[PDB]
Amino acid sequence: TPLVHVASVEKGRSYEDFQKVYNAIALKLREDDEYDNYIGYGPVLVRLAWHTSGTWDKHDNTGGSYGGTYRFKKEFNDPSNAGLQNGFKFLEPIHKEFPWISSGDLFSLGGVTAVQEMQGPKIPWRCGRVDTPEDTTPDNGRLPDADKDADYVRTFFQRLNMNDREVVALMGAHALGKTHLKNSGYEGPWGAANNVFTNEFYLNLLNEDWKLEKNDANNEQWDSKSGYMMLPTDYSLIQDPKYLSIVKEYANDQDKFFKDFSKAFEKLLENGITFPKDAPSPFIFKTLEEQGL
Numbered sequence: 147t148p149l150v151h152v153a154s155v156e157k158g159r160s161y162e163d164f165q166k167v168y169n170a171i172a173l174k175l176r177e178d179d180e181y182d183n184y185i186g187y188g189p190v191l192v193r194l195a196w197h198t199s200g201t202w203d204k205h206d207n208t209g210g211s212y213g214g215t216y217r218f219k220k221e222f223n224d225p226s227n228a229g230l231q232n233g234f235k236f237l238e239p240i241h242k243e244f245p246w247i248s249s250g251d252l253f254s255l256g257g258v259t260a261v262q263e264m265q266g267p268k269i270p271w272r273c274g275r276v277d278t279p280e281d282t283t284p285d286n287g288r289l290p291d292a293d294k295d296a297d298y299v300r301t302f303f304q305r306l307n308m309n310d311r312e313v314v315a316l317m318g319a320h321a322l323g324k325t326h327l328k329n330s331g332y333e334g335p336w337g338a339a340n341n342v343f344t345n346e347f348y349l350n351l352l353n354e355d356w357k358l359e360k361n362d363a364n365n366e367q368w369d370s371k372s373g374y375m376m377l378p379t380d381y382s383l384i385q386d387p388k389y390l391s392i393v394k395e396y397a398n399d400q401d402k403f404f405k406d407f408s409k410a411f412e413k414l415l416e417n418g419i420t421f422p423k424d425a426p427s428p429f430i431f432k433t434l435e436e437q438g439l
């Protein structure tokens with residue numbers, strides 16, 4: 147038997163209210179810019195949007211972005227979530243300013259905000275997630291391991307109802323940010339421009355000379371002479387012939403990657419949620435640049 151989670155618009159709010167939150171997040175991202183050696187909080191916000199959505203299970207409709215359960219200790223302390231506390235504390239002051247927004251809507255909106263402010267595509271976003279109680283927090287272990295191969299990646303993502311194209315598009319977000327030894331047992335960025343959203347991950351995967359090395363934590367990762375790295379799960383995208391075709395596609399067509407990421411990422415953030423027919427349409431927020439702010 148599967149739960150239903152129906153979206154309920156937080157009371158009386160409309161598009162101008164959520165655009166105000168987006169703007170608060172965007173402004174903080176622009177100011178609090180020294181984090182992680184001047185990478186900024188953009189990438190950890192996108193990670194946080196993904197980890198809070200990616201516990202979803204299509205089979206029983208548990209986990210996912212709806213309940214905003216990352217705020218509970220079982221989930222907050224998932225070893226897979228190590229590092230994400232920095233994104234949570236970045237958002238805490240925003241939530242105090244806008245205490246009316248649910249936790250789900252805030253964690254997911256922070257990811258949308260960060261992608262757009264890092265020059266990525268527009269991501270339509272829908273409000274309505276409702277905080278659910280502590281007993282609904284998912285058990286640890288639902289997020290993926292990095293030391294596996296293409297068959298594991300494909301199987302993992304079937305749980306999230308993601309197909310080959312969606313998975314490859316979604317992994318493009320590893321253009322952003324980096325791995326941190328003390329968080330995950332891997333170290334290094336995937337590329338040079340790690341707080342601008344581009345198709346650089348696919349380019350580097352195809353064009354770099356990758357060498358399998360062991361890092362100071364005794365895990366294997368692929369390293370290049372440029373100073374980039376790839377997780378085994380990243381690198382498996384060029385080992386699997388179906389994945390590789392899509393990697394080449396996104397490497398050679400920026401716009402297509404942007405459109406496919408937008409669709410897949412929205413779906414990720416909305417998995418598990420039922421929207422009434424009279425729910426508002428998806429919002430498309432303007433960036434600070436578009437508002438002239």
Ligand code: HEM
Pocket residue numbers: 189190192193195196229290291292299316317319320322323324325326327328329330331332377379
């Ligand atoms: C195979 C599945 C995935 C694996 C194994 C994986 C693994 C990792 C790991 C280990 C990190 C580094 C954390 C750290 O130690 O600092 C990371 C970072 C990141 N992941 Fe993935 N990830 C996966 C999928 C995704 C997806 C689908 C997204 C897109 C929403 C995503 C977005 C990110 C981002 C933005 C970071 C950078 C965070 C930061 O820079 O602090 N990842 N990932």
